[PDB]
């Protein structure tokens, strides 16, 4: 029940510059044998947590010279000399001095990137689905930045809000962008009663929204 507080909760850093995450416990982590049991884990998207530092400053096998650990008692700090794309993920600080072992909330590191307008593509329902009496209209807004993105659907000019499922992806460790998926699901009947479907997106990248649409009768 030894609380481990990390700060900040989310850190945005521009490639090549130093980053710093702070960890702080409710009680000293210095042990009677004179050793401090504090470790730093890193979890990249789609992977398991991986220890990078033990005994507050000791590097783990294969961990880059870039990472550095320091601290004492109740305040530890993980400093990354120069950030790279391969550093995207969540950073946790663990404590193994007082039972039970506890973790910090984790700090999400995001790479500050150059603004990018999404590439928008819209897809009519597949005939195979319509057969089941369902109709899902999909819209993909790929590789854009920042993450601030707003999607809006319009069927025959009028906005529709119910029946929408949006899904964002983790920052792309390759180009540092984000991608979003917007699916508008209607029944077979309602889809066949309307003809103009539009996917509209508003992003920091442009003054006027990006539009993509199609007419049900045209294909």
């Amino acid at each position: 029940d030894v609380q481990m507080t990390q700060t900040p909760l989310t850190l945005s850093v521009t490639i090549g510059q130093p980053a710093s995450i702070s960890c702080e416990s409710s009680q000293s982590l210095l042990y009677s044998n004179g050793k401090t049991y504090l470790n730093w884990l890193l979890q990249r998207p789609g992977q398991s947590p991986k220890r990078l530092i033990y005994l507050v400053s000791k590097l783990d096998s294969g961990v880059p010279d870039r990472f550095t650990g320091s601290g004492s008692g109740t305040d530890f700090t993980l400093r990354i000399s120069r950030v790279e794309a391969e550093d995207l993920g969540v950073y946790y600080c663990v404590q193994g001095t007082h039972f039970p072992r506890t973790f910090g909330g984790g700090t999400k590191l995001e790479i500050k990137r150059a603004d990018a307008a999404p590439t928008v593509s819209i897809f009519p329902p597949s005939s195979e689905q319509l057969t089941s009496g369902g109709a899902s209209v999909v819209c993909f807004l790929n590789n854009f930045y920042p993450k601030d993105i707003n999607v809006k659907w319009k069927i025959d000019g009028s906005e529709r809000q119910n029946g929408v499922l949006n899904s964002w992806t983790d920052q792309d460790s390759k180009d540092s962008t984000y991608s979003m998926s917007s699916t508008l699901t209607l029944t077979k009947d309602e889809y066949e009663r309307h003809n103009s479907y539009t996917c509209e997106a508003t992003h920091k990248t442009s003054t006027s929204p990006i539009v993509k649409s199609f007419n049900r009768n045209e294909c």
């Binding site: 398991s48 597949s126 999909v138 949006n166 998926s181």
Partner: protein
């Protein structure tokens, strides 16, 4: 090479008893160290659950004491985790790990997702997403696959059996009515499609499902 691996159900009913196995290869769980079971809740919070030492002694997280058990089979070199009266609050990714806060020894398994729910396993429906007349100018073409109506997580999506990965974005599943919906987009130059074939492969383990769907264009 050292290695830990979790095995066990991915779906469990509330009130049932969760039972996971962690197999270790490349080191004897009786030699040295403490072997642990840790879980990660959606939202990312981690929670140390308990351990069993190479000596047979165990330690458990106070909040779990009442219903946790960790035993082993030294002859098979694998330790087990048993949690009782599971509730939907027990849905999480379970990892088994072994480490020493002093030495350089540290190893984590790959983790296994465990969903606690009454809902029943349901194979997914897969639909190819072709342009409507999109492929026109730009040298790139985006295609897609819609995976909907399945349960529980997860599903594995690939394109051309892995052959294609260069520009793939597979979106996180959304739970909408006790069922999941997920999508995956792939962008290729206008030379590959519809010239050379593009397929999206979908596998839903829980339902022993394997489906391939070619993305053929609509004639209009």
């Amino acid at each position: 090479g050292v290695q830990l691996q979790e095995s066990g159900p991915g779906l469990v009913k509330p009130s049932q008893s969760l039972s996971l196995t962690c197999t270790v290869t490349g080191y004897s769980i009786t030699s040295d160290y403490a072997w642990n079971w840790i879980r990660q809740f959606p939202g990312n919070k981690l929670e140390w659950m308990g351990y069993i030492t190479y000596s047979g002694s165990t330690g458990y997280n106070p909040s779990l004491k009442s219903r946790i058990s960790i035993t082993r089979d030294t002859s098979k070199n694998q330790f087990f985790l048993q949690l009782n009266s599971v509730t939907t609050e027990d849905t999480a990714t379970y990892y088994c790990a072994s480490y020493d806060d002093y030495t350089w020894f540290t190893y984590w398994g790959q983790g296994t997702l465990v969903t606690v729910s009454a809902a029943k396993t349901t194979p997914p429906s897969v639909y190819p997403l072709a342009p409507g007349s999109a492929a026109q100018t730009n040298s790139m073409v985006t295609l897609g696959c819609l995976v909907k109506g399945y349960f529980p997580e997860p599903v594995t999506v690939t394109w051309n059996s892995g052959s294609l990965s260069s520009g793939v974005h597979t979106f996180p599943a959304v739970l909408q009515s006790d069922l999941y919906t997920l999508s995956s987009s792939v962008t290729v130059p206008s030379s590959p499609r519809p010239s050379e074939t593009v397929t999206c492969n979908v596998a839903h383990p829980a339902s022993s499902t394997k489906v391939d769907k070619k993305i053929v264009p609509r004639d209009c």
